[PDB]
Design a protein around this ligand. Structure first.
Ligand SMILES: Cc1cn([C@H]2C[C@H](O)[C@@H](COP(=O)(O)NP(=O)(O)OP(=O)(O)O)O2)c(=O)[nH]c1=O
Ligand SMILES: [Mn+2]
Ligand SMILES: [Mn+2]
Ligand code: NA
Ligand code: NA
Length: 326
DNA sequence: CCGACGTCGCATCAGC
DNA sequence: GCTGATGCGA
DNA sequence: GTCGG
């Protein structure tokens, strides 16, 4: 964090554009800029120096010069003072509440945590659970707790069917010392790109984790993706652990490497890699890498038998999970 | 100058 | 009910 | 907001 002040500024600007202006490409522009500055191994001395980096243009360069000279940004100082922007930004911190619902709530005079708590009937299920655990979801997860959680998940999954493979991805697989949540990739030989020989594969696992009181709430749930809440068990007279967000994704077993590449992240890393893939004439999702034809249409899936194969196709040197934290 | 910006799952809604 | 778009999220 | 062509 040689340039923590700058990256903080840009992230706050990113959040404004996403939540208030509802301009998603500005949000990504700022986040991309923040990321490239974050890994820049010098303390930045000027906006001109920063503009040399890919993703930093004229406007951000000027903001960096203002921030360097004064320690502040007048544009952000004004935004911070605005009631509507501040209220909208706050409401979006609740899981299930996005830019649209936040602005609608503020219109209806619901703009504080207290306002939300007395208008619970106006929330959908996701938002209601998000409000319930607002405090808990603010807290990060120490890696040591992540290891406890991994142990439970992998063992409970094993008990259902010993041919399941569960892999913890996201920031954990990238070796982070603390995570925002837990991300679990799931495979079973019955579910491939060719066929589904077994129903309720994800359901079976979710059910087991509920039975042992690990999973406590559900935000969303379908055939391949689960979004919910979990909690570590605590001992006698111990204060309870905070409730944690958990994401589970069932991927066709023969498409594990594309799946694990996707869910390992980071989000910005995926954006950068897939953009580069397009430049190289391929498209990548969580299932396949495919060539783009002359007319621009995706062709048939290419052979993949390691994460590295995917890097090879787009002419990138392989990068370990710990080097993908962009 | 300006088109494009990664890709997709689940909840919810409009229109039929 | 289905189809397609919108919102929020991974 | 940025940038490749
Ligand atoms: C949010 C997001 C996530 N992903 C993939 C890559 C992420 O690393 C992976 C898990 O999402 P996450 O749990 O929201 N983020 P994280 O695990 O990287 O970091 P954190 O510690 O959970 O905050 O899902 C995307 O591909 N695009 C996205 O926009
Ligand atoms: Mn995560
Ligand atoms: Mn997650
Ligand atoms: Na630049
Ligand atoms: Na939210």
């Amino acid at each position: 964090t040689l340039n923590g002040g700058i990256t903080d500024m840009l992230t706050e600007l990113a959040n404004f554009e996403k939540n208030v202006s509802q301009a998603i490409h500005k949000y990504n522009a700022y986040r991309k800029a923040a990321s490239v500055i974050a890994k820049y191994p010098h303390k930045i001395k000027s906006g001109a120096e920063a503009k040399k980096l890919p993703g930093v243009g004229t406007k951000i360069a000027e903001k960096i010069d203002e921030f360097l000279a004064t320690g502040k940004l007048r544009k952000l100082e004004k935004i911070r003072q605005d009631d509507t922007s501040s209220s909208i930004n706050f409401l979006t911190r609740v899981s299930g509440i996005g830019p649209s619902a936040a602005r609608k709530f503020v219109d209806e005079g619901i703009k504080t945590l207290e306002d939300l708590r007395k208008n619970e009937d106006k929330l959908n299920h996701h938002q209601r659970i998000g409000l319930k655990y607002f405090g808990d979801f603010e807290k990060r997860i120490p890696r040591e707790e992540m290891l406890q959680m991994q142990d439970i998940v992998l063992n409970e999954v094993k008990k259902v069917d010993s041919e399941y493979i569960a892999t913890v991805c996201g920031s954990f697989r990238r070796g982070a010392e603390s995570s925002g949540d837990m991300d679990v990739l799931l495979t079973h030989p019955s579910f491939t790109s060719e066929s589904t020989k077994q129903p309720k594969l994800l359901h079976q696992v979710v059910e087991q984790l509920q039975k042992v009181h690990f999973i406590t709430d559900t935000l969303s749930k379908g055939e391949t993706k689960f979004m919910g809440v979990c909690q570590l068990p605590s001992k006698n007279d111990e204060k309870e652990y905070p409730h944690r967000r958990i994401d589970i994704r069932l991927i066709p077993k023969d498409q594990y490497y594309c799946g694990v590449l996707y869910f390992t992240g980071s989000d910005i890393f995926n954006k950068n890699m897939r953009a580069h893939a397009l430049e190289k004439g391929f498209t990548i999702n969580e299932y396949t890498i495919r060539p783009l034809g002359v007319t621009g249409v995706a062709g048939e899936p290419l052979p993949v038998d390691s994460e590295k194969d995917i890097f090879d196709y787009i002419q990138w040197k392989y990068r370990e999970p710990k080097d993908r934290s962009e």
